Design a protein around this nucleic acid. Structure first.
Lengths: 52, 84, 48, 7
RNA sequence: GACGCCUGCCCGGUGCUGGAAGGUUAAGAGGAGCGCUUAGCGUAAGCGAAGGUGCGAAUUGAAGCCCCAGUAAACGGCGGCCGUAAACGGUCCUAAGGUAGCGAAAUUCCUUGUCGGGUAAGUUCCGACCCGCACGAAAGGCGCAACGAUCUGGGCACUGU
RNA sequence: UUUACUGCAGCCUGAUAUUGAAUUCUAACCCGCCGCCCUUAUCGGGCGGGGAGACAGUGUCAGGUGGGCAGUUUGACUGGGGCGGUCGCCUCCUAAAAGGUAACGGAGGCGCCCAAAGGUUCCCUCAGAAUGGUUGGAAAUCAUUCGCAGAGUGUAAAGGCACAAGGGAGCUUGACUGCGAGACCUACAAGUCGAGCAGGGACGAAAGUCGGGCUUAGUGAUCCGGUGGUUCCGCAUGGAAGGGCCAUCGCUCAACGGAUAAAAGCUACCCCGGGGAUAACAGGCUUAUCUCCCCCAAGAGUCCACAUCGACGGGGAGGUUUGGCACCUCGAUGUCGGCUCAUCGCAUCCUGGGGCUGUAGUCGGUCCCAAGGGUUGGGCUGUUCGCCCAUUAAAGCGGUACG
RNA sequence: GGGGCCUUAGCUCAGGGGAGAGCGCCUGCUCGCAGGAGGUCAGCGGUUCGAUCCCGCUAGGCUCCACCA
RNA sequence: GGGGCCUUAGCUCAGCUGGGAGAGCGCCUGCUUUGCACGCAGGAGGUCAGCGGUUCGAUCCCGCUAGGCUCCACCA
């Protein structure tokens, strides 16, 4: 439940995946569920499914 | 000077990007009317900057562009504060 | 701060002298007695 | 310039 | 400036349109008041009513200017440094820092940029990389059949060039 | 051409006359509105109706906007012009032992300050080294010597000053009114010194000194206006308006002897009068660069400076490059690259003859003598040059107005 | 090559009497606080009692020109 | 023709002025990973362009041969 930098409040959902070598940390905005940023950036070609 | 510059030197908003975003989101009014991030201020205006669930209203006294607290807390004068 | 001043006689009334003074060191009106050509004597002269 | 264009 | 798909952001300044809350307002009205003369009061030097004659202070007195909003197929503009792998983060500045689509171009100094094709050999040409000094969306952008006494390359035939 | 200056049309907006009467009304005024007549007539006029109406239009005055249209301005120096820089005053050097003396020569300052840092009288002598001192350490303040000045002299350079012009106290305003014999500089305008007289002073007992600061910069004409004084004039007379004289004020007139109160740019659409007084091309003079030839010698070269290269430096030749100057040409010297025709000098690309080789032979390297002859066909680019392809005994450098 | 503006904390920038912000790092305190590490103020040398502050030069980074034959 | 820098693994490249040859990508081996081609260690590959001189060892120093980039002036 993070306050935005402009003053209002918008809930953020942080996703932690622990899958060994496929582990990643991905933050979403919890309303549209688009990836704001990821700890490991993946391409549409390399790891085509679940592109970060 | 500009509104975001005045908020930066008056230490109300410590970052110019945050003040620019707040004023571009339509939160700050000068002399009652709404204004953008670049409205020129005069000594003797009534700022109506809106924080998150705050209604801080200050009064302009001087305009100096110094980035030091010795010459910064002498331009804005708080009149009244309203939570909601 | 250094302006042109004139010195008129207190008795005769004519502006006989000009000089200069610094306003910051001398804010008050100066008083030097000088020779008056009309009165044939040294009279007090006042800044006007 | 010195262009030889006499007419 | 056929046609097809589009024409992104910025109203800060200047133009255009709308608005007097408040100042700046000209001529014209208005006449306070102050000089010059003197019938006369005055021992001296001055004071002076009624007229005439100059200067005219306050108060009124529109558009326009300062100001406030919109308008960019109006004029016009669409930035720098440091990191991190276009994109994101920190900072200055402005009104905001170039979207789509093109790109060594009728635009590129370096420069004959690099690679490939064409030739035995190609500073010209064609197709891509972006490393765009200094492309860019009606001073239009990207394609486009047909068309051209247009410009630039390459072949066949043809010949005293 | 424009946000150069100064203005003109055009447009907008007020006042005033047409222009009346209580928002309203209608006789003024206006109808490229309708019917009749002149009248054979979409001109005009008159007559009726209707619409607008004291608005508009027009005349006069005023303010905005106004390149749309005019008249002009937009400096000079300059090793050509543009651009950059500078423009006035003061100090030193250049300046050649009087004075003066230039360059876009070498160094710096000034457009002030001080009622005292001015005048007089009376006293005193500075900066640094050491020793000793408690907070003092290299330095705050204090005593001593050595101190002719290594200090200070408002501001900055020179000259000068401790017989102090340098520091400290008392009293004062000479930081003066009228002047001024005689001089210095010399286009003028202007600038500078000055004994001494009179009137009134200041200090000092008196002699005496004082007409600003130790000196030399700190400032600008005239015109036009402002202020104060005036037994000056004042258009017939008396006044006044005004002018004269004296004192004084208003300039980054800074391009500082200042064109006007008021002024920026483009011309490859350009024109005229002149200049080789002045640039671009090619000649001329120099050679900083440029191309070659040398001197010394550390070293590399297995040992070895000199088979061959050659550091750090040093000396030259040539006028082919880039430059410098502006001598010749601006009442014309056509400028690149190619085609055609050539000619000349070797500092020689090959061919010919040699020396030394770390030259076993072929092929080579370096240095001599030698211009007789020959020193190519293309792809790219306007290109010279350059790169590449294929040859060749080699595909040489330059000069001849870059023939 | 010639004019103009700067070289300041790790980064980006304000600024004659002794110099600072936001971000990056810490410190205890449950969306904001009150404090600390880091500065040859790019370097040299002159004017005075001291220079980031005034100047003559060296390196560096931007901006505007380098036109006429 | 004149100066300079290089030829190093299949590719792109360091190796300090002689003290004993490597990084990344690329190819295999093994481990590990619940799963999305996201991980680790271990192997090769080089006469350091070719030859021969120096010294105890040479990419480095030296001489002799093949190669590639730079570097050189216009002009009106």
């Amino acid at each position: 439940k993070s306050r935005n930098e402009i003053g209002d409040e918008t809930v953020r959902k942080l996703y932690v995946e622990i899958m060994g070598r496929h582990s990643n940390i991905i933050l979403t905005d919890a309303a549209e569920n688009v990836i704001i940023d990821g700890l490991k950036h993946l391409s549409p070609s390399m790891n085509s499914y679940r592109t970060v | 000077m500009r509104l975001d510059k005045f908020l930066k030197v008056s230490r109300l908003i410590k970052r110019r990007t945050l003040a620019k975003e707040v004023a571009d989101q339509g939160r700050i009014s000068i002399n009652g009317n709404q204004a953008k991030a670049s409205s020129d201020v005069k000594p003797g205006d009534e700022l109506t900057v809106r924080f998150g669930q705050k209604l801080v209203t200050v009064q302009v006294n001087e305009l100096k562009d110094t980035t030091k607290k010795e010459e910064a807390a002498n331009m804005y004068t708080i009149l009244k504060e309203e939570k909601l | 701060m250094r302006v042109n001043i004139t010195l008129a006689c207190t008795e005769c009334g004519e502006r006989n002298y000009i000089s200069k003074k610094n306003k910051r060191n001398n804010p008050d009106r100066v008083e030097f007695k000088k020779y008056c050509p009309r009165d044939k004597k040294s009279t007090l002269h006042r800044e006007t | 310039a010195a262009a030889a264009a006499a007419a």
